[PDB]
Amino acid sequence: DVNTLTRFVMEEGRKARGTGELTQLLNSLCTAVKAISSAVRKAGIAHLYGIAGKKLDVLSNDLVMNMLKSSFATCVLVSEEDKHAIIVEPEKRGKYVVCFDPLDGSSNIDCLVSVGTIFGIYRKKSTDEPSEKDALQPGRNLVAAGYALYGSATMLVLAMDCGVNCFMLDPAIGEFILVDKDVKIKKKGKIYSLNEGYAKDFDPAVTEYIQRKKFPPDNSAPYGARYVGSMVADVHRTLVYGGIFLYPANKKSPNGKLRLLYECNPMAYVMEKAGGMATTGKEAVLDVIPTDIHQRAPVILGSPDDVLEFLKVYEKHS
Amino acid sequence: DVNTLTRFVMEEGRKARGTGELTQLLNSLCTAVKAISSAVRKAGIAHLYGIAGKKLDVLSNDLVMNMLKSSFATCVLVSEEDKHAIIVEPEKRGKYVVCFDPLDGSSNIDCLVSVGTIFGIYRKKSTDEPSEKDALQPGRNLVAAGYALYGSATMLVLAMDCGVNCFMLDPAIGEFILVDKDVKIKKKGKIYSLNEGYAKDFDPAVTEYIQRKKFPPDNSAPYGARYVGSMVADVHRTLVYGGIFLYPANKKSPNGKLRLLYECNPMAYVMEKAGGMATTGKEAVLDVIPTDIHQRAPVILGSPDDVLEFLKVYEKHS
Amino acid sequence: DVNTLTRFVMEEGRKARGTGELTQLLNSLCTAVKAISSAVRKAGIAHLYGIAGKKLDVLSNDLVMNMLKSSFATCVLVSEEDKHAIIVEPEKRGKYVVCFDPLDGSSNIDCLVSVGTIFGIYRKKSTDEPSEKDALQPGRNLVAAGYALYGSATMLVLAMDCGVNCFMLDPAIGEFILVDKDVKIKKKGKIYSLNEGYAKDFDPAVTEYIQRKKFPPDNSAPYGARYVGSMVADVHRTLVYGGIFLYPANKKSPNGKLRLLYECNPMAYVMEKAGGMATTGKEAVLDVIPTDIHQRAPVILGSPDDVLEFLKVYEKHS
Amino acid sequence: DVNTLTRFVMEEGRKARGTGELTQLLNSLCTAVKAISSAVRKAGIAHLYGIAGVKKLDVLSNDLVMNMLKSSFATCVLVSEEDKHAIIVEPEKRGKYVVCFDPLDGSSNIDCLVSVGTIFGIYRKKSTDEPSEKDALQPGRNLVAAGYALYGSATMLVLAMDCGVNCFMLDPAIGEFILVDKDVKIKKKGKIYSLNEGYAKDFDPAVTEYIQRKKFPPDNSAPYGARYVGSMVADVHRTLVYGGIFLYPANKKSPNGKLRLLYECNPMAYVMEKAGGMATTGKEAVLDVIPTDIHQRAPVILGSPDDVLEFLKVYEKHS
Ligand SMILES: Nc1nc2c(s1)Cc1cccc(OCP(=O)(O)O)c1-2
Ligand SMILES: Nc1nc2c(s1)Cc1cccc(OCP(=O)(O)O)c1-2
Ligand SMILES: Nc1nc2c(s1)Cc1cccc(OCP(=O)(O)O)c1-2
Ligand SMILES: Nc1nc2c(s1)Cc1cccc(OCP(=O)(O)O)c1-2
Structure with a gap:
């Protein structure tokens, strides 16, 4: 019985009997990762070289930022690329706080060394106006965390209370297939x-x-x-x-x-x-x-x- | 002015004023590399997991072997996967000898570590019927050599007398774009x-x-x-x-x-x-x-x- | 603010305040469509022709059948490919009935004419054992319907009570992007x-x-x-x-x-x-x-x- | 024995015992077609819609063919639907071939996702003087090669020459045109x-x-x-x-x-x-x-x- 990241996430969310926010957050994150992977594998680099006649780190950061904000599931975003915590505008605020490194190891990317995306998800613990303080929680409070590895192949490792599951990205259909359970x-x-x-x-x-x-x-x-x-x-x-x-x-x-x-x-x-x-x-x-x-x-x-x-x-x- | 592996190879071949064999050999190797890259990035892995209800190293070896044999430019092929040198059947024999490692580092592929394809091309020296002996030449006799790195992105490094040139594979159009000259x-x-x-x-x-x-x-x-x-x-x-x-x-x-x-x-x-x-x-x-x-x-x-x-x-x- | 088929579907499902079944069904259908699209564009056809040394309509039918069954959201499946209605085994039964044509126009496929997937979704209106009878409802009872067009580009048109929305499949990341609302x-x-x-x-x-x-x-x-x-x-x-x-x-x-x-x-x-x-x-x-x-x-x-x-x-x- | 457009073209070129120009022209055309196909199937359209927070397809297609052909060093006069006048390749990139083409045929109705394609005809410059629009005014009888790329359910390149007509299917997984129909x-x-x-x-x-x-x-x-x-x-x-x-x-x-x-x-x-x-x-x-x-x-x-x-x-x- 094949399982996809989408299906897995949707099912765990159903079991949690919540608002469905984390599901939307994870789905958005998933989409951002596939977009980052496509850019990392250099899709379209031919156009950059004149076939028809600006940094991966920044693009990766934009992808995650935009997908997370538009998910309506977050309120405070901390990124390795930004000096200050980003505060999501009121009309798109959700109850989650996300800390992430959009493209880890992108400093040596010139040698095509493996790179990845690391993320940690927290539930905003206070009712105070969202601020950088909401991301100052001990990792013990994590609700979910993981990373995407852009190596020989692209894999997303997702950890939650139920354990750690590994999904392989099938480039032919843009789908994360579950290949390693618990x-x-x-x-x-x-x-x-x-x-x-x-x-x-x-x-x-x-x-x-x-x-x-x-x-x-x-x-x-x-x-x-x-x-x-x-x-x-x-x-x-x-x-x-x-x-x-x-x-x-x-x-x-x-x-x-x-x-x-x-x-x-x-x-x-x-x-x-x-x-x-x-x-x-x-x-x-x-x-x-x-x-x-x-x-x-x-x-x-x-x-x-x-x-x-x-x-x-x-x-x-x- | 954009340049592609195909264009580059074809031009160097024209300048050499030869039979065009090495051009055909390199074009075939290029095609095999893209096929290996697609399999390494796990295209279609979803079908292996039942979405609709061979080992990478073996497949890679098959791809190189088949493309090189069918190029009509080779006579003896030595691979990391085979104990004995493969001798091309008479009706497909060319004057080149190729030694290669179809998927270098495929042993620790479980961790998605970068893997690659290494190759060395020699001109058959002896006139005897092709045998393993034709692959026993010192590297000093190489006519061309290089490798394909399947890392964050796929790149083919090709070395010849004219120097070393690096090509980036653009997955969107399956073309190796020249990004680093000499x-x-x-x-x-x-x-x-x-x-x-x-x-x-x-x-x-x-x-x-x-x-x-x-x-x-x-x-x-x-x-x-x-x-x-x-x-x-x-x-x-x-x-x-x-x-x-x-x-x-x-x-x-x-x-x-x-x-x-x-x-x-x-x-x-x-x-x-x-x-x-x-x-x-x-x-x-x-x-x-x-x-x-x-x-x-x-x-x-x-x-x-x-x-x-x-x-x-x-x-x-x- | 970008929107994806996944995001869209999940949001409409949240507003409906149901069990989440239709969401799972739609997600599964979405995954099947991307897989069909990949096969229709002939991904891997090179292997079929010996680069390394089932019929599209049948494959398409298998993809939809398997994704829908594994969604746990359906009970009766009618396909133009099977003479009798398929009855989902008890342990995977959901409350939806789906009628579909896996690959419409696949008879004149040899000329590369556009082809597509058509589907209609009904809610089982009975309390007895699922049978072919559950698929004999007037189209007026449809809960959702649409099609996927595999033309110059791949697009999924989804119709529901809230209207008709068109999503374009971005091959680079395997994601259906909303390009035409209502x-x-x-x-x-x-x-x-x-x-x-x-x-x-x-x-x-x-x-x-x-x-x-x-x-x-x-x-x-x-x-x-x-x-x-x-x-x-x-x-x-x-x-x-x-x-x-x-x-x-x-x-x-x-x-x-x-x-x-x-x-x-x-x-x-x-x-x-x-x-x-x-x-x-x-x-x-x-x-x-x-x-x-x-x-x-x-x-x-x-x-x-x-x-x-x-x-x-x-x-x-x- | 598998065969690809590149291999096929290179072999026919070897048999013709020429300068190899037509081979480079066809290779360039092949590359442009894959790029057009990628764009027609809407690769990256997500960026156009703000996933990270633009020219028309016919224009892009025309640019792709124009640039690849010019850069092939095998052409001198290029006629396309886009430019009212025949384009004359700069002296330092001139080859002996003349190419007439329609970068993206049917792109007037590309909104309904109807099949589209690229049509091309290749002629050998038959004059000694300076390349001009006049060199593209030859009867089709003089064609050295012609064909088209169809961007339909799948992408196929049909190439016709003296040896006959051969059909190649583009395998998107490896960006290779596989020969599936000979003569x-x-x-x-x-x-x-x-x-x-x-x-x-x-x-x-x-x-x-x-x-x-x-x-x-x-x-x-x-x-x-x-x-x-x-x-x-x-x-x-x-x-x-x-x-x-x-x-x-x-x-x-x-x-x-x-x-x-x-x-x-x-x-x-x-x-x-x-x-x-x-x-x-x-x-x-x-x-x-x-x-x-x-x-x-x-x-x-x-x-x-x-x-x-x-x-x-x-x-x-x-x-
Ligand atoms: N998609 C997923 N959601 C959740 C997963 S996986 C694991 C989990 C634990 C607790 C609450 C959750 O969701 C709470 P809510 O965001 O629905 O309110 C979830
Ligand atoms: N495509 C390329 N060909 C050659 C390159 S790159 C470098 C080189 C050196 C000597 C002979 C060659 O060609 C020898 P032949 O095999 O054509 O007879 C070539
Ligand atoms: N993902 C979507 N779900 C639904 C959509 S879109 C439109 C709709 C109408 C009525 C019930 C639904 O859901 C019923 P249930 O299957 O969740 O119980 C849904
Ligand atoms: N790649 C191909 N070239 C040619 C093919 S296929 C068939 C043909 C006939 C006559 C001249 C040619 O080319 C002559 P030249 O362009 O090498 O001078 C070619």
């Missing part, structure tokens, strides 16, 4: 992912942990290394193959580099729903209470046994 | 790429070189690290951003891990034509004389200054 | 459409009417003639440009040739919702009470002034 | 007649009688069926595939017909003759008419031989 990450993996070019500035715990992956003190097989440089790609591989992903804090960056609202929380949410873990080293990413919409946060996530092991090393240096 | 790699980069999970087994020279990238002895800025795990993706980033890529021998791969005929030689050829370098440590990849179609070869390639620097360290440990 | 047909047109090859067998009223279009009584300019041979194409042109379409009953087809349940009623419903008319000559198509799911019905539809004029001629010969 | 030949006699009967009042007596014979066969055989899309490429293609006859004759108001000789009539007449069919103006074969104006009109009756011959019989009776 996904669970491997208990322990064999791959570690992080930019080792920062070795010199690594925190001692990170240095020792990576050293244990390369030189297992018990002489077991060393972990393999992978680092794409695009969070959505690295996190998705971690979910699919298991293992651990790190973008830790150091003396020069006490809070890390990745952003909490639209990068860390969404991925941490997907991880926990899949039976994985996501920590900053001091606490679970989802429990961090934000004070600034663009605040950074250190993050170590992936297979539970792997994160637990990291925390063990971290505790030793604490 | 490409040259940066003299020196700031990124090193290799699987550091093998640290324990690294040869001393590799260990020291990597150490110099992380802890510059001249206290300059440390290089950044990237490792996708897919050769076409890692090599393409190296070409575009500069830097160095390594897959040196391991103690469990005394002769390196990558294959000489359809992975190393093609990439080394593209690098040299772009002003870059490609060495095994002992000699230029292109000068190695193969004795077996699937033999492995160590490889260090990328920006000249970076490779030269590695060779300096290598020589110190020799 | 469409109304011209009061009077300048085009008449019917197969004049049947002149010899025409009913005197039809003969006189056509005669008035060619040799105008009020010395007005003669109407232009157009006859594609595909109902969806001819009817759509009528809706867009106005005028009249005819497929009357001659001497051997006293009951016409087109089918009442999945050709005539749906188009008649779209016409009336657009301010147009649809008559059999004796009564409004929508008022005919069917006794056989495949019974034929004569039909004259289009601009009101044009149909009224035909009826005037018809009455003179009655 | 096509039209049926000797068909059962369908096509023309705008709304002009009955102004029909020439011969046309009136001929149509009368199709509807009321004298020997009481089965009457012909009628089809009229209103788009020449669609009507002509159906004629080629199913056989029969297509007419757009001269009448009271239009003594020289309505269709254009250089980029509508000649190309279709050439495809018909190469397929074993016929194309007459009533007085002579369309291909033999010597044009004096690049946009001159010409009456046309084409299709299955037996059907055209029969028309000519009626025509001669009224002459």
